Write an enzyme that holds these catalytic residues in place. Structure first.
Site, PDB file in Angstrom:
ATOM      1  N   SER A  31       0.793  -1.323   0.248  1.00 26.75           N
ATOM      2  CA  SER A  31       0.159   0.219   0.322  1.00 26.75           C
ATOM      3  C   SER A  31       0.873   1.195  -0.051  1.00 26.75           C
ATOM      4  O   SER A  31       1.300   1.698  -0.957  1.00 26.75           O
ATOM      5  CB  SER A  31      -1.401   0.155   1.385  1.00 26.75           C
ATOM      6  OG  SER A  31      -1.167  -1.372   1.426  1.00 26.75           O
ATOM      7  N   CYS A  32       1.289   1.945   1.034  1.00 28.40           N
ATOM      8  CA  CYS A  32       2.672   2.586   1.534  1.00 28.40           C
ATOM      9  C   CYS A  32       2.901   2.674   2.530  1.00 28.40           C
ATOM     10  O   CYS A  32       3.417   1.701   3.166  1.00 28.40           O
ATOM     11  CB  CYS A  32       1.578   4.362   1.731  1.00 28.40           C
ATOM     12  SG  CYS A  32       0.352   4.878   0.698  1.00 28.40           S
ATOM     13  N   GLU A  33       4.227   3.717   2.492  1.00 30.70           N
ATOM     14  CA  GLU A  33       5.402   3.223   3.553  1.00 30.70           C
ATOM     15  C   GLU A  33       5.923   1.671   3.214  1.00 30.70           C
ATOM     16  O   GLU A  33       6.941   1.029   3.799  1.00 30.70           O
ATOM     17  CB  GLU A  33       5.100   3.632   4.433  1.00 30.70           C
ATOM     18  CG  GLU A  33       4.106   4.754   4.794  1.00 30.70           C
ATOM     19  CD  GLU A  33       5.426   6.040   5.009  1.00 30.70           C
ATOM     20  OE1 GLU A  33       4.826   7.045   5.145  1.00 30.70           O
ATOM     21  OE2 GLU A  33       6.473   5.638   4.536  1.00 30.70           O
ATOM     22  N   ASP A  34       5.337   1.370   2.241  1.00 36.04           N
ATOM     23  CA  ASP A  34       6.303  -0.479   1.822  1.00 36.04           C
ATOM     24  C   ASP A  34       5.922  -1.025   2.642  1.00 36.04           C
ATOM     25  O   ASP A  34       6.133  -2.611   2.748  1.00 36.04           O
ATOM     26  CB  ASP A  34       7.488  -0.399   1.069  1.00 36.04           C
ATOM     27  CG  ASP A  34       7.319   0.124  -0.050  1.00 36.04           C
ATOM     28  OD1 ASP A  34       6.435  -0.449  -0.994  1.00 36.04           O
ATOM     29  OD2 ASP A  34       8.161   0.368  -0.720  1.00 36.04           O
TER      30      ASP A  34
END
Length: 262
Positions: A74-77
């Site tokens: 998603s985000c920030e992996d």
């Protein structure tokens, strides 16, 4: 382009032919990137020791590759989450070999560490939501480094109060939630399957019996609580919470007991 990043962790000395060997195994795309990312933020040599067992065992390689890929991308992996899951994995395979059998004390610490790292990740995930251009790996390391000493293990926006705050919330959650969590922990579980085979089956049985005597009733003790009787899914969810709470009570009992031995 992986044999590159894998080997950049070995010294100028042993620096790839062993790792060009794997360049087409499922998820080397993603595993390489993960490494790149890790170096791009002592340690070097231990990371290499890790990579050694990954050469030595195929099964472990596939599992670690899999873990690197399974992230919620998603985000920030979730670089920190991935790093921590890669250790949980190695711990599992290590325990599975039998490395903690006559050393369940060592396992107890590592678990403690790991628990604290898990929590620091949640705090960091949270903090980074209010920071621009600061990836969560950076904030995690800030915490991990600065509380390396204080929790027996420089980023702009993370302050003295945050560190002192994070340290407190860990210490709180460690006292109140640790034994309960170790009880549920994949590495502890391999060890129990390994050394205490028998007490294990008895715990298995112990939970079937608890389900039998208490699932339905405990399930109704929530739809009367949340006031959501009738709704099909609200029952779904309350069923699952009951599963997890019976598994929690079983294995705690089991941990309590198997640790009392040592």
């Amino acid at each position: 382009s992986l044999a590159d990043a894998v080997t950049a962790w070995f010294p100028e000395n042993k620096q790839s032919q062993i790792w060009h060997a794997f360049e087409h195994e499922e998820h080397a795309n993603t595993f390489s990137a993960f490494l790149d990312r890790l170096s791009d933020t002592g340690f070097r040599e231990q990371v290499a020791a890790w990579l050694e067992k990954l050469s030595a065992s195929a099964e472990l390689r596939q599992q670690s590759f899999a873990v690197a890929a399974d992230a919620t991308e998603s985000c920030e992996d979730r670089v920190a989450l991935t790093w921590n899951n890669l250790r949980k994995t190695l711990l599992v395979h290590q325990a599975s070999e039998g490395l903690f059998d006559n050393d369940t004390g060592a396992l107890l610490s590592l678990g403690r560490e790991m628990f604290r790292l898990e929590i620091l990740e949640d705090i960091a995930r949270d903090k980074v939501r209010t920071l621009h251009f600061v990836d969560e790996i950076e904030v995690y390391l800030a915490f991990q480094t600065m509380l390396a000493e204080k929790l027996q293990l420089g980023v702009s926006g993370v302050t003295a109060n945050d560190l002192r705050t994070a340290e407190a919330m860990v210490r709180s959650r460690e006292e109140n939630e640790f034994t309960d969590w170790f009880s549920l922990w994949g590495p502890w579980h391999a060890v129990l399957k390994r050394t205490e085979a028998d007490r294990w089956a008895q715990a298995e049985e112990q939970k079937y019996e608890m389900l039998e005597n208490e699932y339905s009733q405990r399930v109704a003790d929530r739809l009367k609580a949340s006031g959501l009787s009738g709704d099909a899914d609200a029952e779904r969810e309350a069923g699952a919470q009951v599963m997890r709470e019976t598994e929690q009570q079983i294995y705690r009992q089991l941990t309590d007991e198997v640790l009392a031995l040592r």
